[PDB]
Design a protein around this ligand. Structure first.
Ligand SMILES: O=C(Nc1ccc(F)c(Cl)c1)N1CCc2n[nH]c(-c3ccccc3)c2C1
Ligand SMILES: O=C(Nc1ccc(F)c(Cl)c1)N1CCc2n[nH]c(-c3ccccc3)c2C1
Lengths: 132, 136
């Protein structure tokens, strides 16, 4: 079979996004609403716009199919939100953040927050790293 | 909410691909095997290559997640298995075929062929030409 990495063409890796803890990412619901709020006209556009746009379109739609399936099945519903949910919380956040703040900024922040959150509370700085 | 069209940025529509009958498209298995055979290095490449490549990568992976899910659902029934392959299956058979064919024969060619075969298969057997339209 093949082994394809969705973040590879965007300069990152699966393991790199797994560096960030599970509770770091917003809910799938909050992510879909943000994609729409900031890029509704662009995501529905006839233009490619950018590779980030192309991937995000598939991501939103793919999660749609996944929800349509689990809704039809009705732990099973909980399965999508627990295991599959985490995967899209990463993917959706990655592209939205890259479109909003820029690829390079997102990547630096990723390693910066991973090191920061892993530092015990007593020693780590009060202000977490930010995008800009 | 949003209404996003996966084929829209590629100059087609969901409705346009639904023009071709369900038995027109190869199986998902034959489609995934074809994707690897022709574009294994490109699909795994660090370079975008093309918007079709970017979309095709997500499609393969998305189908993967659906299969990983259905594989786990099954282990925890046969009626459910028919759902993934009957309803969701058709959707990806179109999507996978669309991108694979566009990369192989060229976007513009695929679209002309798409409409040509739709008209051809819909003509009753007695009247329609013996030779169906082809690509390139
Ligand atoms: O990861 C995120 N948020 C986030 C990203 C993508 C999303 F799709 C969603 Cl729903 C949320 N941040 C962590 C670091 C950071 N630094 N600066 C800002 C910021 C906050 C408000 C306005 C402007 C910037 C943030 C928020
Ligand atoms: O839709 C398809 N086939 C197809 C496409 C994408 C796929 F991902 C898979 Cl698995 C199959 N055809 C219908 C019209 C046509 N015209 N010409 C050719 C052809 C055949 C062999 C060698 C060279 C050309 C074909 C085959």
């Amino acid at each position: 079979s093949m082994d394809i990495d969705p973040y590879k063409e965007f300069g990152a890796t699966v393991e790199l996004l797994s560096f960030l803890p599970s509770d770091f990412f917003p809910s799938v619901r909050d992510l879909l609403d943000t994609a729409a709020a900031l890029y509704r006209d662009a995501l529905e556009s006839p233009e490619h716009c950018s590779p980030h746009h192309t991937a995000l379109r598939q991501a939103i739609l793919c999660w749609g199919d996944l929800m349509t399936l689990a809704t039809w099945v009705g732990l099973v519903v909980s399965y999508v939100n627990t295991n599959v949910g985490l995967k899209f919380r990463q993917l959706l956040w990655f592209h939205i953040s890259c479109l909003t703040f820029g690829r390079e900024t997102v990547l630096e922040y990723l390693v910066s927050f991973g090191v920061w959150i892993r530092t015990p509370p007593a020693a780590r700085p009060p202000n977490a790293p930010i995008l800009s």
